[PDB]
Design a protein around this ligand. Structure first.
Ligand SMILES: Cc1cn(-c2cc3c(c(C4CCCC4)c2)C(=O)NCC3)c2c1C(=O)CC(C)(C)C2
Length: 209
C-alpha cells in the first residue's frame, strides 16, 4: 500500500538548503503554495473550455486556507486540476530537477530564497515553515493519492483511503514549533494582501471557532 521513493539528488540538496539556511522572510511559502494552486486552477479552467465534462467533478474554482492551532497545521485546499500518480512520482520531479539545479546555481551567484518561484520549484519553500508536508490530490484521470515527506531524502506515495475530494489538492503543513504565527488570522490576512492580492480566484480564510 505505501511506496517509498528517494528524491532526485538535486531536490534533496534544495530541501536540505531550505531547512538549514537562516532566512527570516519565511512568509513567502504561502504565496508560493497559493501560486501552485492558482496554476492548477488555470489548467482545469483552460481544459474545461474544450471539454466541459472536466468540471463534472466540481464547477467551483477556489482556494481555502484552513489554520488549526490544536493540530499545529495550515491546510491549503484548491479545486484545481489535481495531480496523477505519475505527476507526484515522475512528471513534476523531472521538471523540478532542471529548475532546482538552476536555482542552486543562482543562490551561489547572489540570488535570495524569495526568487524560488522563477525556477518553478516554489512548492519546496513549504519546508521553510513545515517539518512535514502532506499532499492529498485528485485528478480526473486517476485515483485519490497521498504524497508525504518530512525531507531527509525520501517521500511516500499511497492511495488515499480518507474523505473523497472530487477534484483538486489539499496541502497539509505540519508546522515547526517556532512557526505558529502562520496559524494567526491577522498574520495570514497580511501575507495574502502583500503577496497574493491579484490571484484570479477567491481565497477564503477559514476562521477557527
Ligand atoms: C515542482 C512541483 C510543483 N508541485 C505542485 C504542487 C501543488 C500543485 C501543483 C500544480 C499541478 C499542475 C499545475 C501546478 C504542483 C497543485 O495542484 N496544488 C498545490 C500543490 C509539486 C512539485 C514537486 O516536485 C512535488 C509535488 C508533491 C509533486 C508537488
Amino acid at each position: 500500500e505505501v511506496e517509498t521513493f528517494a528524491f532526485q539528488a538535486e531536490i534533496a540538496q534544495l530541501m536540505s538548503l531550505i531547512i538549514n539556511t537562516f532566512y527570516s522572510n519565511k512568509e513567502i511559502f504561502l504565496r508560493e503554495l497559493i501560486s501552485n494552486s492558482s496554476d492548477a486552477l488555470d489548467k482545469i479552467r483552460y481544459e474545461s473550455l474544450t471539454d466541459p465534462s472536466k468540471l463534472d467533478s466540481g464547477k467551483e474554482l477556489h482556494i481555502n486556507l484552513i489554520p488549526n492551532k490544536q493540530d499545529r497545521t495550515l491546510t491549503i485546499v484548491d479545486t484545481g486540476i489535481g495531480m496523477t500518480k505519475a505527476d507526484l512520482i515522475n512528471n513534476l520531479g523531472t521538471i523540478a530537477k532542471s529548475g532546482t539545479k538552476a536555482f542552486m546555481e543562482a543562490l551561489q551567484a547572489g540570488a535570495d530564497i524569495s526568487m524560488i518561484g522563477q525556477f518553478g520549484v516554489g512548492f519546496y519553500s513549504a519546508y521553510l515553515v513545515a517539518e512535514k508536508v502532506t499532499v492529498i490530490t485528485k485528478h480526473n484521470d486517476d485515483e485519490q493519492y497521498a504524497w508525504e515527506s518530512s525531507a531527509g531524502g525520501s517521500f511516500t506515495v499511497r492511495t488515499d483511503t480518507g474523505e473523497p475530494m472530487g477534484r483538486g489538492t489539499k496541502v497539509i503543513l505540519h508546522l515547526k514549533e517556532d512557526q505558529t504565527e502562520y496559524l494567526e488570522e491577522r498574520r495570514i490576512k497580511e501575507i495574502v494582501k502583500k503577496h497574493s492580492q491579484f490571484i484570479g480566484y477567491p481565497i477564503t480564510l477559514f476562521v477557527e471557532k
